[PDB]
Design a protein around this ligand. Structure first.
Ligand SMILES: NC(=O)c1ccc[n+]([C@@H]2O[C@H](COP(=O)([O-])OP(=O)(O)OC[C@H]3O[C@@H](n4cnc5c(N)ncnc54)[C@H](O)[C@@H]3O)[C@@H](O)[C@H]2O)c1
Ligand SMILES: NC(=O)c1ccc[n+]([C@@H]2O[C@H](COP(=O)([O-])OP(=O)(O)OC[C@H]3O[C@@H](n4cnc5c(N)ncnc54)[C@H](O)[C@@H]3O)[C@@H](O)[C@H]2O)c1
Ligand SMILES: NC(=O)c1ccc[n+]([C@@H]2O[C@H](COP(=O)([O-])OP(=O)(O)OC[C@H]3O[C@@H](n4cnc5c(N)ncnc54)[C@H](O)[C@@H]3O)[C@@H](O)[C@H]2O)c1
Ligand SMILES: NC(=O)c1ccc[n+]([C@@H]2O[C@H](COP(=O)([O-])OP(=O)(O)OC[C@H]3O[C@@H](n4cnc5c(N)ncnc54)[C@H](O)[C@@H]3O)[C@@H](O)[C@H]2O)c1
Lengths: 297, 297, 298, 296
């Protein structure tokens, strides 16, 4: 009973495989009784649908009680585009987009409304920075703005188009990273700047959507995870966290899944505009404890 | 999703059903935990009488219709760490007659003997004898009493309970926005004590996370008409301000903080430590009041 | 002697009149002995140069000693463009841009290098959000990205192109606002998000430029000022009133107050200061509650 | 640009030339302020003698070649607000022999009598008797002594000097990053006291801004090999900062002296309630760059 989401509907944007935070969030929402629909980047939609229907993901879909999560629909969604007239001709003609239609944010919200009705829960678990491996001193304007469009404005647009079909008391969460607030070398390409914008937008939308729709908006600042996007260096980031955080333990995608479930549930009915660290306590440290400036183990 | 059956909690600072301590205890019991209370000795008799008379039956009532039951109600004076610290005047004070073994160290010993190791520790207690005084009119003695009762008491609770907490266990304390930004009327060095308390939450997250594998977090709550608050009408203005200026226009109930504390003290929060979680209808996010006399109605 | 900038050169990007923060920063730098060159948005360059030459600005140029500030040059600069190839044809042909050349960030840094040599001090005092009056729920992708391009990435680009000609121990400063950290109704169009990205880039560039160039990078989070930009959007008046009535220091905020704080951050007095956001706002940032709320008694 | 001639400063917590207090006092005097000092009474004799002997002549030398002179050096024990707070064993301690009128209230009265109103107030003093102990091993008595000596002392200084400060005057205190994020080894409840001190800086900025028109700010400083620091490791903290901060450079006491001069001057007339980091940019970092988890 403490977290009962039966009768509620969730839309989770940014799920293309079982290895990232988006999958873990969707799995927790389903285990708590929510109907869960997914938005998936259209070029990888076929591969994802194929891996679901083949039974290759059946282990990753397994719930504590032994049943398998089922999705209320898997919708193609490209969060770089708000409406059909924004999609350039090269994209519409791109073979990777052949045989999918209606994948702009506005069109997805219309389909969800038609197929499922009003929703209660909105998840933004997507990011893309084409110049992420470049330091900010070597990042182009185009790379920097692509990071911001894909990773920060996509959350604003999701709220603009889903907000109108969200029930009062409903909730939205996005994922961020400590680089928004403090310098993490290697998180380049204007991704740090985009995550800072995204946390600022979390607060501003908490105000705007709180007033207009009675909807809560929060962020989780997560620690490092070997997702498919991250492994495409991530190994060093995870070792650093393991060796320097208050809690000496592995960070699992389920750890963020569980924290998202809270922020998206009635337990969190007074919580809005927060950045909740889910990173084994690392955000609290003012000094590495394994620095070569200090004595060893 | 939150199953605390088999776990034991100790909630320090519960003397009635109107405060945040009671609401947290109630949420822990609804999720299956055994819950013991620590109560300031002069009001222990009154509280025990209220419980036993049935006066609190409505307040004890869960969703399923059972009433919460406590595994023990212990006298606890968080001003005193060991029996040697208790002055003769206190031992002889009539308000302490018929109660024994109420220092922090003694209570932790009794809990270990009666209940065994605990998983969950809650510090929901504060006392500022000069809280109505601005900081420019607060004496050293009043300021230090605020810090002793409200900040150091959390450190001492962790020092004495930490050794009897299971690995993976968790502690939470309660703070207020005045720790980070100026709230006129929260005086007597209570703002300073809450800043110390939030800093200690981080420091203890590191020390207790390393030493005990215990998580330590804080909730920064909004205004609530508790018995402590209504005795100081000012609490009424602070509530009105929040209602009129927060992202979520709704009443803030003690249950709202109870639900958030339940999360932080549960396995869903297994990667969360050292945080200050705002549970305040989003107010913390605002940079301007919206009902200022400087702006149009 | 405590702030002596004689022998140093500053470039101040985003000065088109005497009513904004950029002018006050330039004026303080000059009073401390720095040579000061300006970057000015090309469409308003003609009007600005005419004002300077006509004597209209002589009172605003006046220093405490009674001399008038002089600029080591006034350069057309459009901080939306990094290189000549980025400029679209409809801009090159726009009548507002007729008669000016070489105004991209890279070309301005080249001209500064050629005309003045290396610099010590860099100021970014420019922002532009075409949808600033729109709430975030009504702000388009195009307006949100223009706000970021003009107001946040422009600082990154300035450091990338001026960094190689900045002396070790040099210093850069930008201007932000509280809306980057907490919600201020009416600061819309993705400008709050752009200022958050700008403060984050201030820290990241402090690391990158501190390691590579030994250059310091800081931000000032300023209070409300009735500049030409602000009064063109009576909203700035309400924001000013709110600050006056709710801040720890009950006093008017003058552009010179930010000018003095920038002079510190850009001087050898600040040699150990980098990556900060310094509030210059009469203490308003420190407040957790308005004191003239209708929820409270008068 | 910064001209403090005609202004008067009181700098609490100067007992030698190696700490931040001295550097702030030196910068204030170079800018033309008259500077009085408050000195912990048990080291007052040694400090006065080192001044009068000429031993401090190099450290007193200004850029132009004159030596700073103080408007007076007052005994001050910031653990005590008024005479009746001082226990008998302190009054009788030989270290406090021959010194009188050293509670905060008394010093403020003497300053007003000797010098008149002041413009500038500096709090550069801390003491945590249990600083080497982790918080899980810190006693209540040790924790409260850290708070009394290091946080409340600033509140008391404003309460007693506030009434003799000119409108537009200014106060500054010194903090450290341990107030906001965990620094192992900064124990004894000193991290907690620095957090309370930063919070009090904000609350006093409001209270003293409204009542007196006085600005109140804090500098969060990096590690410095002062006498207090070398008595306690400080070498490891300094190395860490050198190897991990944006600016790879030594942090000198004059770096904080310069930043304090700014906060205490008319250039900062719109600045109040801030925590200004003067630490080579280290506060901005979210990761060490010489961690053994990463490659050399
Ligand atoms: N260490 C980490 O992995 C880490 C740390 C902190 C935060 N995060 C954040 O968590 C979120 C999830 O990341 P993950 O690493 O689990 O990645 P992931 O492997 O789930 O990849 C990111 C997802 O975004 C989707 N995506 C990218 N561009 C898209 C677009 N235009 N339209 C629709 N979908 C798009 C991708 O298809 C993919 O599903 C991200 O916002 C990321 O920044 C990740
Ligand atoms: N508006 C509010 O009520 C408000 C706002 C934010 C935070 N909080 C925080 O929530 C916590 C609980 O507050 P509440 O308002 O619900 O109070 P409450 O009415 O429960 O009173 C505080 C509790 O502390 C206990 N206590 C005080 N001194 C004690 C001692 N020496 N030993 C043992 N117990 C002692 C009291 O007996 C009482 O149970 C406090 O830390 C408070 O600062 C309250
Ligand atoms: N209340 C305020 O006025 C206020 C408050 C806080 C911060 N700020 C910040 O202070 C800074 C200066 O603002 P101001 O209000 O003093 O403005 P201002 O009137 O000087 O206008 C901003 C300047 O930016 C220049 N500019 C705009 N787009 C440009 C481009 N593409 N290329 C080159 N220059 C361009 C304009 O020509 C103008 O000189 C801005 O960053 C602003 O966001 C202002
Ligand atoms: N690494 C560092 O040295 C460091 C780092 C950050 C912040 N700080 C802060 O800077 C300030 C000055 O420290 P420093 O290391 O330059 O110190 P220091 O060596 O000047 O010693 C501290 C001073 O405080 C004085 N003092 C202590 N207790 C006193 C009392 N009860 N009454 C009056 N004076 C008393 C001492 O006599 C001494 O003058 C302190 O607040 C310190 O916490 C220092």
């Amino acid at each position: 009973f403490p977290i009962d989401l039966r009768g509620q509907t969730a839309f989770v944007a940014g799920v293309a495989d079982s290895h990232g935070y988006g999958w873990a969030i969707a799995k927790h929402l389903a285990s708590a009784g929510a109907r869960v629909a997914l938005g998936t980047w259209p070029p990888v939609l076929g591969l994802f649908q194929k891996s679901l229907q083949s039974g290759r993901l059946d282990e990753d879909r397994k719930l504590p009680d032994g049943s398998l999560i089922e999705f209320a629909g898997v919708y193609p969604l490209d969060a770089a585009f708000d409406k059909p007239e924004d999609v350039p001709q090269d994209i519409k003609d791109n073979k990777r987009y052949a045989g999918v239609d209606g994948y702009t944010i506005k069109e997805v919200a219309v389909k969800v409304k038609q197929d499922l009705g009003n929703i209660d829960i909105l998840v933004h678990s997507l990011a893309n920075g084409p110049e992420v491996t470049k330091p900010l001193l070597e990042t182009s304007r185009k790379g920097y703005l692509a990071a911001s469009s894909n990773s920060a404005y996509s959350f604003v647009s999701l709220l603009q188009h889903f907000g109108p079909i969200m029930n009062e008391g409903g909730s939205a969460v996005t994922l961020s990273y400590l680089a928004a607030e403090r310098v993490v070398p290697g998180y380049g390409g204007g991704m740090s700047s985009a995550k800072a914008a995204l946390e600022s937008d979390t607060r501003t939308l908490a105000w705007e959507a709180g007033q207009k729709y009675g909807v809560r908006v929060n962020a989780i600042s997560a620690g490092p995870l070997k997702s498919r996007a991250a492994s495409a260096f991530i190994d060093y980031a995870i070792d650093y966290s393991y060796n320097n955080a208050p809690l000496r333990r592995d960070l699992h995608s389920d750890d963020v899944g569980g924290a998202a479930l809270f922020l998206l549930s009635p337990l969190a009915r007074a919580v809005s505009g927060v950045t909740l660290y889910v990173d084994n306590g690392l955000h609290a440290m003012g000094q590495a404890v394994d620095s070569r400036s200090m004595p060893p183990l």
